[PDB]
Structure 1
Amino acid sequence: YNYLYRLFRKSNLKPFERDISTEIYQAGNKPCNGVAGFNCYFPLRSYSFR
């Protein structure tokens, strides 16, 4: 999974607003703090190299 890709983001992005700083989705009162819990996703997944 060396070729990381950002499947999830805050919302749609305008052109040239590329994803450089990873900001995971927040959908709760508390921000996602070090845990990949429910409704909170991380870009760390295999890029289908099989």
Structure 2
Amino acid sequence: FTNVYADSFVIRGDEVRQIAPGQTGNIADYNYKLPDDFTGCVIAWNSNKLDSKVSGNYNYLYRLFRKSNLKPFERDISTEIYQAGNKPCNGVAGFN
């Protein structure tokens, strides 16, 4: 092959079933998509005896919400608050 692109990310064991080409989910839509012409392999390893924490690990965060479907192989760095209604959010959570 020509080149390899390694994507390092941590996904909990309930949400690992959406990693396959042509899925639908929380991570499989607004975060990480696999197209039908995607070619490669998936390597996973159990980090629960090392990277876990008793009070919970807040060092990594994940995106549930997005306005539309995200294009694959693209990172979302945007800190913009999702606005459901016509009320302005002003950077913080609130009504709509």
SS at match of 1:35: coil
Q: Which has the larger radius of gyration?
A: 2
* Shift in Å, 1:31: 2.6
Q: For structure 2, list consecutive stretches of 5 or more residues without a partner in the other structure.
A: 1-57
| Cα RMSD, aligned residues only | 1.8
Q: Count residues with an aligned counterpart.
A: 39
Higher helix content, 1 or 2:
2
2:64 corresponds to: 7
Q: Are the structure 2 counterparts of residues 37 and 26 from structure 1 closer, same or farther at C-alpha, using a change threshold of 3 Å?
A: same
1:26 corresponds to: 83
Of structures 1 and 2, the one scoring higher in RCO (CA 8 A, sep 6+) is 1
Where in structure 1 do 4 or more consecutive aligned residues deviate above 6 Å? Answer: none
1:37 corresponds to: 94
Query: Take 1:38 and 1:30, find their aligned partners in 2: how far apart are those partners?
Result: 7
Query: Take 2:87 and 2:71, find their aligned partners in 1: how far apart are those partners?
Result: 27
Query: Take 2:92 and 2:79, find their aligned partners in 1: how far apart are those partners?
Result: 15
The percentage of counterpart residues that share the same residue type is 100
